[PDB]
């Protein structure tokens, strides 16, 4: 009857947008991470941290706008507004990249709030919390890429920047410096993504082509009401179709829909482990037996060595500007180039 | 020789590859878009050197 | 000694054997190139 | 090629050990009722 139970009743009121105890952490953190990105990409520059323009006010479009990471000299500083760097100045806070840690940290607790929102609502309606368990993969991906990776390198500088074009640069950086395509943990992560996209398309199409005729309309969408007890599509006909076309086929609905949870969730977890290894530069960059052979046999060539030559080009050409704090200066005569080009 | 510059590229396991690096190499750039079945080469040895199997597959 | 009432039997049907054999045979084919290196 | 010497026994046991684990559990299931 106390104030605690009175407050508990108000939070769990069945309204249009459910609040809940998790909302006290979710709503303010999700609103500031997004609003901070919209404020950054619209007004804020990145001239004194990267030497780049990155707002609509400077002339960037939706593809090139970004909230760039702080400079490399800032280290792993939290860059708090009241901290020893900005010293309370909001203008100087934006000029050194305070919004990047403002978005990463508020967005991190926002993810925690949303996952707690999945646990809270699942308990109230009395369902199994498998949706919350599935959200663990997007969280492990966000933590390893945006937090564990920059903490392993020199600073927040080499973390991803919240932008469409700044993310494309992130992948090309990982190809040239990490050979991230050769890492078997990204390969399993690729299989979990492309596999989940396969299951999502093949399950929805199989359902749409094995339905029962429960209606008189040529568009078979009105022949369904949520309160049936019978299946809307034939499970035994879909099993025979895929048994004769592909060889095997699902025979259990509960296993099928768990398999659609396991494949994409496990894939993202494996790719998060590979990024945790790259924070220490523990790469899958080379095959030693290949390099011992290719170094003493100038006629041995494989697609592995051809890709390493491409990696050596990405590093030597993008480094001077992508890493301006290093003050790289490469004369024209040291740049790796093929013939003519 | 995929690029047609007399620079062959090893692609099979018995020639120093693994599952990650092995590959069936595309046909030579000297052929271009020309149809190149087995019976257009003077033998199999010529057919394998110019990336013949890639088109058949 | 009286027997333990907490004991349960274990099962693994035929389909789970194929799925498991497929997983470790593919994980081996993927990782073997890195074991030899 | 100069590959690792333990890579052979690494792959062999990586296949064998979890294989027999599933095989033991399956044959003991079909021998039930």
């Amino acid at each position: 009857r106390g104030w605690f139970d009175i407050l508990d009743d108000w939070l769990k009121r069945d309204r249009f947008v459910f609040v809940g105890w998790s909302g006290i952490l979710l709503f303010p953190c999700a609103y500031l991470a997004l609003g901070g990105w919209l404020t950054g990409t619209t007004f804020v520059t990145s001239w004194y941290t990267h030497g780049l323009a990155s707002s609509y006010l400077e002339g960037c479009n939706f593809l090139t706008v970004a909230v760039s990471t702080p400079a490399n000299s800032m280290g792993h500083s939290l860059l708090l507004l009241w901290g020893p760097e900005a010293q309370g100045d909001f203008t100087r806070w934006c000029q050194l990249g305070g919004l990047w840690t403002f978005i990463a940290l508020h967005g991190a607790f926002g993810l925690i709030g949303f996952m707690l929102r999945q646990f809270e609502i699942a308990r109230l309606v009395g369902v199994r919390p498998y949706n919350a368990i599935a959200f663990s993969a997007p969280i492990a991906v966000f933590v390893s890429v945006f937090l564990i990776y920059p903490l392993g390198q020199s600073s927040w500088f080499f973390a991803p920047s919240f932008g469409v074009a700044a993310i494309f640069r992130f992948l090309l950086f990982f190809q040239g410096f990490h050979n991230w395509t050769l890492n078997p943990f990204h390969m399993m992560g690729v299989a979990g993504v492309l596999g989940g996209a396969l299951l999502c398309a093949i399950h929805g199409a199989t359902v749409e082509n094995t339905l029962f005729q429960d209606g008189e309309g040529a568009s078979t969408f009105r022949a369904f009401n949520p309160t049936q007890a019978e299946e809307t599509y034939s499970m035994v006909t879909a099993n025979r179709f895929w048994s004769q076309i592909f060889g095997i086929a699902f025979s259990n609905k509960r296993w099928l829909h768990f398999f659609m949870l396991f494949v994409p969730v496990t894939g993202l977890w494996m790719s998060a482990i590979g990024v945790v290894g790259l924070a220490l530069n523990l790469r899958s960059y080379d095959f030693i037996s290949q390099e011992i052979r290719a170094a003493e046999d100038p006629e041995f060539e494989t697609f592995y060595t051809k890709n390493l030559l491409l990696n050596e080009g990405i590093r030597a050409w993008m480094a001077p500007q992508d890493q301006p704090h290093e003050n790289f200066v490469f004369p024209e005569e040291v740049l790796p180039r093929g013939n003519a080009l | 020789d995929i690029d047609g510059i007399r620079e062959p590229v090893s692609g099979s396991l018995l020639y120093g590859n693994n599952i990650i690096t092995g590959a069936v190499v595309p046909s030579s750039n000297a052929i271009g878009l020309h149809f190149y079945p087995i019976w257009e080469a003077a033998s199999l040895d010529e057919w394998l050197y110019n990336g013949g199997p890639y088109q058949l597959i | 000694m009286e027997p333990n009432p907490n004991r349960q039997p274990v099962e693994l049907n035929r389909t789970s054997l194929y799925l498991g054999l497929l997983l470790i045979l593919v994980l081996a084919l993927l990782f073997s190139s890195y074991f030899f290196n | 090629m100069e590959v690792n010497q333990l890579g052979l026994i690494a792959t062999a046991l990586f296949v064998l050990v979890p294989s027999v684990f599933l095989i033991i559990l399956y044959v003991q299931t079909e021998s039930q009722q």
């Binding site: - | 396991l13 | 194929y18 073997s32 030899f36 | -």
Partner: peptide
């Protein structure tokens, strides 16, 4: 030893296909 190890694993996966199709557990209706 490498080439024999890769093709041996490849042959097992193909042999695994033959049993998972023609020696599967029949799905039965009730």
């Amino acid at each position: 030893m490498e080439t024999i190890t890769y093709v041996f694993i490849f042959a097992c996966i193909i042999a695994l296909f033959f049993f998972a199709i023609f020696f599967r557990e029949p799905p039965r209706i009730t």
